[PDB]
Amino acid sequence: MEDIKIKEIFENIYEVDLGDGLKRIATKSIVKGKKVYDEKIIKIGDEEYRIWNPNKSKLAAAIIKGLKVMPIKRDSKILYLGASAGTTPSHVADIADKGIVYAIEYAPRIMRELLDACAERENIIPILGDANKPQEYANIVEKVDVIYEDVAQPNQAEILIKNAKWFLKKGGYGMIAIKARSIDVTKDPKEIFKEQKEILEAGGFKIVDEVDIEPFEKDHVMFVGIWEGK
Amino acid sequence: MEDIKIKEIFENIYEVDLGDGLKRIATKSIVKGKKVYDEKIIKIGDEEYRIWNPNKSKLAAAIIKGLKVMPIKRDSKILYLGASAGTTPSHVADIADKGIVYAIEYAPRIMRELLDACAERENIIPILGDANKPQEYANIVEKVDVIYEDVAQPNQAEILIKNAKWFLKKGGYGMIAIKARSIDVTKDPKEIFKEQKEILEAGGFKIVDEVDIEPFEKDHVMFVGIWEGK
Ligand code: MET
Numbered sequence: 423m424e425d426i427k428i429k430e431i432f433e434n435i436y437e438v439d440l441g442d443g444l445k446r447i448a449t450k451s452i453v454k455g456k457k458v459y460d461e462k463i464i465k466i467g468d469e470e471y472r473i474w475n476p477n478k479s480k481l482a483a484a485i486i487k488g489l490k491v492m493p494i495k496r497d498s499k500i501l502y503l504g505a506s507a508g509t510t511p512s513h514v515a516d517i518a519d520k521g522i523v524y525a526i527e528y529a530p531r532i533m534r535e536l537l538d539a540c541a542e543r544e545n546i547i548p549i550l551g552d553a554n555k556p557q558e559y560a561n562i563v564e565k566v567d568v569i570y571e572d573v574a575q576p577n578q579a580e581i582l583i584k585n586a587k588w589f590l591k592k593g594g595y596g597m598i599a600i601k602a603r604s605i606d607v608t609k610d611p612k613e614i615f616k617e618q619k620e621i622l623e624a625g626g627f628k629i630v631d632e633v634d635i636e637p638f639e640k641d642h643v644m645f646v647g648i649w650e651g652k
Numbered sequence: 653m654e655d656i657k658i659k660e661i662f663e664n665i666y667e668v669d670l671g672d673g674l675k676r677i678a679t680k681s682i683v684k685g686k687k688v689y690d691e692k693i694i695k696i697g698d699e700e701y702r703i704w705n706p707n708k709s710k711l712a713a714a715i716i717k718g719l720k721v722m723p724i725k726r727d728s729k730i731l732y733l734g735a736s737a738g739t740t741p742s743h744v745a746d747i748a749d750k751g752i753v754y755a756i757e758y759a760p761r762i763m764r765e766l767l768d769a770c771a772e773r774e775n776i777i778p779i780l781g782d783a784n785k786p787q788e789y790a791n792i793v794e795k796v797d798v799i800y801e802d803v804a805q806p807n808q809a810e811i812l813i814k815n816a817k818w819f820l821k822k823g824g825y826g827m828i829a830i831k832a833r834s835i836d837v838t839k840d841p842k843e844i845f846k847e848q849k850e851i852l853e854a855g856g857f858k859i860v861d862e863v864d865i866e867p868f869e870k871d872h873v874m875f876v877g878i879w880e881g882k
């Protein structure tokens with residue numbers, strides 16, 4: 423065997439080095455004994471490190487591909503926008519174990535799967551809603567430190583901006599995974615991302631990180647921006 | 653012609669988009685009318701933006717290649733370690749126009765060139781010394797926010813650590829450009845960087861950024877770390 427090293431990176435996220443030259447990361451499970459999506463687990467005593475698969479989570483893909491700005495901390499309040507069976511939300515909940523994760527889902531069937539997958543992760547607050555209409559859940563969602571968005575729609579940038587106006591603290595962060603083809607099927611991906619970046623900046627964000635998440639996702643880029651208001 | 657856009661990035665650093673698809677950056681000159689190293693200049697009214705050449709400055713190369721953590725701000729106190737004719741120090745001085753740059757040089761001939769190149773940039777404080785002996789200039793160098801090191805020697809990591817112990821504020825940053833071959837001429841560069849990273853972490857740094865600066869420099873990596881003490 424080779425030496426093994428698990429060290430904390432960012433805050434409450436862990437780099438896993440099995441000595442085989444492959445990059446791996448994990449989160450500390452807040453629900454021991456449960457596998458959310460058949461992820462591999464490294465159990466040390468009572469602590470369980472859930473291997474965070476970049477092939478199944480765009481956030482893990484961004485970290486594996488070089489993300490340097492990771493605003494989600496242990497006491498962070500996060501607004502999660504986007505269809506999910508529970509994969510990324512489960513890991514985000516592990517990270518923000520002293521915080522809250524508001525998960526917005528429109529389809530009851532999607533929420534059904536999310537509730538089953540993230541069962542017992544009590545810091546996740548499910549909210550049936552439409553991200554394009556944040557005013558509807560504004561009496562539920564308190565001001566957040568981070569908005570994480572994974573919505574493959576042409577108006578995804580506009581959605582992040584409106585939700586930021588309603589819920590993001592000044593100085594807070596917006597993380598958005600953008601699928602180029604969900605915006606335009608003709609333009610070159612390079613140009614699409616340039617235009618989307620401009621839209622986010624015009625909306626009030628100062629872009630501080632940008633990660634191409636290939637080969638885990640084709641023509642998808644994770645943008646991270648600090649919210650400065652208007 | 654194509655549209656031209658100069659926008660601030662990080663703090664007091666500028667992205668220059670001439671509309672030709674090439675990435676360019678610049679700093680706002682604090683000594684108008686003077687070219688330090690025949691750099692190109694964009695003069696707008698009385699303001700002069702000095703194009704920061706990545707082929708001549710490892711710091712510019714790191715930014716061009718994707719650096720996301722840039723701790724040098726307008727009021728930063730910086731300890732600059734490494735031979736220089738004035739290129740990078742001139743730009744760092746432009747950035748930290750409300751701060752101080754302590755430039756340590758051992759050879760009088762090097763200091764001679766630095767003083768001539770950075771003439772009029774009064775926020776640069778030249779100090780003839782040996783970086784391996786920080787105690788000698790400890791009554792001159794006040795606590796700093798950032799240490800920038802460009803020393804191609806096998807003991808460069810040790811030098812950063814000792815200077816950090818003496819001058820770097822807790823929470824401050826260390827930026828070091830490491831030439832793999834100056835450490836070992838046999839080992840694979842990949843392994844050298846891994847070992848150097850470990851040395852820096854053991855020394856008290858939490859690495860928060862790592863930038864391969866090729867093709868501007870072969871087998872050179874810019875590391876950025878937050879100083880947590882011991
Ligand atoms: C389709 S559910 C798994 C992927 C989802 N985008 C997530 O990160 O949760």
Ligand code: MET
Nearest residue numbers: 709736737738739740741
């Ligand atoms: C040899 S002087 C120019 C390069 C130097 N390393 C600098 O950045 O100032």
